Amino acid sequence: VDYKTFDPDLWAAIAKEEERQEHNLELIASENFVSEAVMAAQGSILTNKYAEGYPGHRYYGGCEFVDIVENLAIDRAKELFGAKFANVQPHSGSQANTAAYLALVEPGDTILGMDLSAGGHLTHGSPVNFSGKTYHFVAYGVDPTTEVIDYNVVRILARKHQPKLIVAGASAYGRTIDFAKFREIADEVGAKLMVDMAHIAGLVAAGLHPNPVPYADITTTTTHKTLRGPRGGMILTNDEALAKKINSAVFPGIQGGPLEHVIAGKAVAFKEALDPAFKEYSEQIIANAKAMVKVFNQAIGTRVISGATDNHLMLIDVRELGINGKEAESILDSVNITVNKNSIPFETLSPFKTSGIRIGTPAITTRGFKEEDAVKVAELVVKALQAKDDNAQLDEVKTGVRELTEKFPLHK
Amino acid sequence: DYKTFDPDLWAAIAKEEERQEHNLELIASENFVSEAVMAAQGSILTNKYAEGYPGHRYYGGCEFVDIVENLAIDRAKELFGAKFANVQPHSGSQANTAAYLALVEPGDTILGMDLSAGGHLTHGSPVNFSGKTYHFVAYGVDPTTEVIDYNVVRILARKHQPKLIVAGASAYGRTIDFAKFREIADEVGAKLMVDMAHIAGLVAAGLHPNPVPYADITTTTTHKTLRGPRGGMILTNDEALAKKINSAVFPGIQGGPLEHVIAGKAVAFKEALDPAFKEYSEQIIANAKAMVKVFNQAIGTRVISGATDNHLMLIDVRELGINGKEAESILDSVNITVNKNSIPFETLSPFKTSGIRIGTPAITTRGFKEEDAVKVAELVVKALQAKDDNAQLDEVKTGVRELTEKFPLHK
Ligand SMILES: CN1c2c(O)nc(N)nc2NC[C@@H]1CNc1ccc(C(=O)N[C@@H](CCC(=O)O)C(=O)O)cc1
Ligand SMILES: CN1c2c(O)nc(N)nc2NC[C@@H]1CNc1ccc(C(=O)N[C@@H](CCC(=O)O)C(=O)O)cc1
Numbered sequence A: 001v002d003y004k005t006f007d008p009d010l011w012a013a014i015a016k017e018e019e020r021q022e023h024n025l026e027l028i029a030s031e032n033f034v035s036e037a038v039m040a041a042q043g044s045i046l047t048n049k050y051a052e053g054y055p056g057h058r059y060y061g062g063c064e065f066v067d068i069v070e071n072l073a074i075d076r077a078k079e080l081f082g083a084k085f086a087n088v089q090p091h092s093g094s095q096a097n098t099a100a101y102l103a104l105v106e107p108g109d110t111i112l113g114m115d116l117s118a119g120g121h122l123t124h125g126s127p128v129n130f131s132g133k134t135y136h137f138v139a140y141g142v143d144p145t146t147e148v149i150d151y152n153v154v155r156i157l158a159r160k161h162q163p164k165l166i167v168a169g170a171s172a173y174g175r176t177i178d179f180a181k182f183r184e185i186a187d188e189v190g191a192k193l194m195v196d197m198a199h200i201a202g203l204v205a206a207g208l209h210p211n212p213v214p215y216a217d218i219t220t221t222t223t224h225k226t227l228r229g230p231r232g233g234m235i236l237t238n239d240e241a242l243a244k245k246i247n248s249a250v251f252p253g254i255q256g257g258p259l260e261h262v263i264a265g266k267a268v269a270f271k272e273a274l275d276p277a278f279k280e281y282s283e284q285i286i287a288n289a290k291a292m293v294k295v296f297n298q299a300i301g302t303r304v305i306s307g308a309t310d311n312h313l314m315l316i317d318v319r320e321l322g323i324n325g326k327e328a329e330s331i332l333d334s335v336n337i338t339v340n341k342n343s344i345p346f347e348t349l350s351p352f353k354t355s356g357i358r359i360g361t362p363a364i365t366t367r368g369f370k371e372e373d374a375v376k377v378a379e380l381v382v383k384a385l386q387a388k389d390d391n392a393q394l395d396e397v398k399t400g401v402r403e404l405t406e407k408f409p410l411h412k
Numbered sequence B: 001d002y003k004t005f006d007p008d009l010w011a012a013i014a015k016e017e018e019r020q021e022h023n024l025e026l027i028a029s030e031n032f033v034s035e036a037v038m039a040a041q042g043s044i045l046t047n048k049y050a051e052g053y054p055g056h057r058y059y060g061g062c063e064f065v066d067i068v069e070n071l072a073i074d075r076a077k078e079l080f081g082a083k084f085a086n087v088q089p090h091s092g093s094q095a096n097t098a099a100y101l102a103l104v105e106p107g108d109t110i111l112g113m114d115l116s117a118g119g120h121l122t123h124g125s126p127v128n129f130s131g132k133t134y135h136f137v138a139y140g141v142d143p144t145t146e147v148i149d150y151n152v153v154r155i156l157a158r159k160h161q162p163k164l165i166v167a168g169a170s171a172y173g174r175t176i177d178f179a180k181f182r183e184i185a186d187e188v189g190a191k192l193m194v195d196m197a198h199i200a201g202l203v204a205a206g207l208h209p210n211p212v213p214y215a216d217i218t219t220t221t222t223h224k225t226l227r228g229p230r231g232g233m234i235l236t237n238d239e240a241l242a243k244k245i246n247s248a249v250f251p252g253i254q255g256g257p258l259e260h261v262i263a264g265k266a267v268a269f270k271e272a273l274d275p276a277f278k279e280y281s282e283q284i285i286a287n288a289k290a291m292v293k294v295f296n297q298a299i300g301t302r303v304i305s306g307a308t309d310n311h312l313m314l315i316d317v318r319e320l321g322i323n324g325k326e327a328e329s330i331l332d333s334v335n336i337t338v339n340k341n342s343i344p345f346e347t348l349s350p351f352k353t354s355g356i357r358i359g360t361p362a363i364t365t366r367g368f369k370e371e372d373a374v375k376v377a378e379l380v381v382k383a384l385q386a387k388d389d390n391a392q393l394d395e396v397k398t399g400v401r402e403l404t405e406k407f408p409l410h411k
């Protein structure tokens, strides 16, 4: 509180954001609320250490204890996911994927990855991203009728295009991904397989989604989604030769000094995820998501892509409400429900309007919501979107949000 | 209490805290951030996805994160006079990655400082993305003076016709003539990029010529002499480049920014706008010059170029019959933390090297003045000359203890 007097404007903004998280329903599928330990590690004196290199082999003196922290994160990662090798230095999921491609393919090589509209990430071959700029991406999508991955189409594309690498994983796909089937297709055309499990990494760790690590040549992930850790990336592999290429790619390939205080937060979160309570959290995530999907399915005007969820998220086509994703987002904001607009498969509008919204349950599950409460959130979402600027209706939605946020204090 | 759930992690963090307390941190690129910076990094801002830029995000709920990031952008602009600022780079390497994307094309010819002479890895080392992605030509320093020969730089630029000239250094103790670099770049039709990561605090305090008026793009880290959290930043005065910089950072090479880190950047920039920061920055250079004088007079330690104009020095340890890695290990055993470092025309591998690098930002932050800097330098000399006399080493340890007890850090 002493330093808060020196910079009133900044600490005032941080206080508002704390209230915002307290008083809104955070439904961004890729968000979560980290523990106090995760925040304490990020707020620690480890921010002061330069530690270029890897544990035991640094380019600086004085890394005795940073080496303990980083090996803590590596070892717990290997235990969480069954990988023989782990790199915990990527600053983000985008840095992780950048180094993974460096260890797997050459510039210009052909890569088969999920199309962004269908659910793939920017770094799975978007042409405004390094991935699409550096490599020759062929995109697979979802079936127009079922809106799930057609693995025959993936195989057809793989045979047609003879990719060096197939990428699986998604930012906006609510369904189980068949990594074994992907491995089988990659083997038929002689390609490598990279799996980006960033969104489902927590569910994988809890055994509630098939684990890609045994199948993928390289597995990448973020630490800050369903894994409920600090923001950052990680790279997993079982091949010792790839592990050497990954480590060289991360540093001195594309990064310099690692963020050791963030890596401390990773070690914190990995140990939390190894706790048996974490598995109960993860099942609650899926139970809550399925509960909301059921509410959204019964409502006309919220159309759940593929009609179901197997994991933490849902993609909602809002077009039949006469709105686009950007306006659906702002409507829900005006009643203190935070989502993001999101492209849906076969998206026809720009990535800034879109035809839908995305909703995920990890953050409300973390603050304590159960299925009854998830159901109330979805009902509130449907009500707000059907309101059509009936301000009385909207204020009732605000009331229900207020009841939910008071029933489940977060930072209080 | 949450510390009881993970005793191994929290013990390691506590040991690192004592280590910073009881060792002399002489690593030129390190510092000790304020309680406010750590509090900002340890805040709830880590929970926010904020892809995009203030006002134009891909997520809901960014009203207050937008305030924070604009605080950091605006303070960066007031500190350095840049018309545009990008505060989202996760690191200095990410900053430079986006800068190159905004300036040149893969395979283009870039003229950057050789690593041994003092340049950074991202200034064209062939094990780095820079050397792999672009055709780098290196300029170095004169062998006799160990400072930059700007006529040799002009000859190289004329000969190789680079699309881009990069100036800036990780281990160069002397003033860089950014005006001269701009002039050379203009003669051969090149763009100019300046990576001021090490001197950014000195630049902010007006103690090193400011590159922002000269460089097409200026990159920096926020965590060296700027005494901020770990991260990068990209500055420019050109509206077209600013747009290319922003697209290069996101969605070019990053995803969501680290908003708690950007909060810490905003904290640190306001600290640097305070007049005490200028006195801190002046003390940095005074302490560095004080140590250089000790090293010059000591037999066995040779200061590269024989002088410093900024925060750091390269010490050629070869006359002591050791290499930089051994010098690093000796000094660590007496609680002095340095890093081995290549010297100009380095003949050994980057993991052995012929020297060590020493900088004063961190001991200056603990409060050291020139008298105390002189004692640090004398202790470094005593330890490197100790040569298996364990009694001498114990005396060095005692002197380190007197200094760290006199200038408490985390206590
Ligand atoms: C993380 N990300 C994401 C993703 O990567 N993949 C899916 N399926 N869904 C999502 N949802 C949320 C988020 C969306 N991020 C995006 C998505 C698309 C773009 C994009 O194409 N932008 C272009 C054009 C933007 C425009 O026309 O407005 C650019 O030049 O920046 C830029 C950022
Ligand atoms: C940040 N960095 C640095 C730098 O970039 N530039 C200078 N002048 N001085 C320094 N000092 C500290 C630090 C040193 N970092 C380095 C320096 C050199 C290398 C390098 O050449 N590595 C090679 C192999 C080196 C070897 O033979 O051991 C590699 O394949 O990884 C890798 C990292």
Ligand SMILES: CN1c2c(O)nc(N)nc2NC[C@@H]1CNc1ccc(C(=O)N[C@@H](CCC(=O)O)C(=O)O)cc1
Residues within 6 Å of the ligand: B141, B142, B143, B144, B149, B151, B152, B155
């Ligand atoms: C000291 N010295 C030096 C050195 O001895 N060794 C190295 N590696 N590097 C350097 N760098 C700086 C300095 C030498 N610099 C130069 C650079 C260029 C020239 C040069 O081309 N002079 C020609 C004239 C060339 C012309 O005008 O056509 C000559 O005949 O003197 C002569 C000397």
Ligand SMILES: Cc1ncc(COP(=O)(O)O)c(CNCC(=O)O)c1O
Residues within 6 Å of the ligand: A030, A091, A092, A093, A094, A095, A097, A121, A123, A169, A170, A171, A172, A196, A197, A198, A199, A222, A231, A232, A233, B049, B254, B255, B256
């Ligand atoms: C599958 C996947 N991979 C990589 C990333 C990139 O991580 P960083 O933002 O840390 O670079 C994301 C981000 N997904 C964000 C979202 O879905 O909202 C992702 O979903």
Ligand SMILES: Cc1ncc(COP(=O)(O)O)c(CNCC(=O)O)c1O
Residues within 6 Å of the ligand: A050, A255, A256, A257, B029, B090, B091, B092, B093, B094, B096, B120, B122, B168, B169, B170, B171, B195, B196, B197, B198, B221, B230, B231, B232
């Ligand atoms: C001039 C310069 N530019 C970029 C970087 C890279 O920043 P990151 O480590 O955050 O990627 C460094 C690191 N210099 C580290 C040192 O001198 O010890 C640097 O000195």
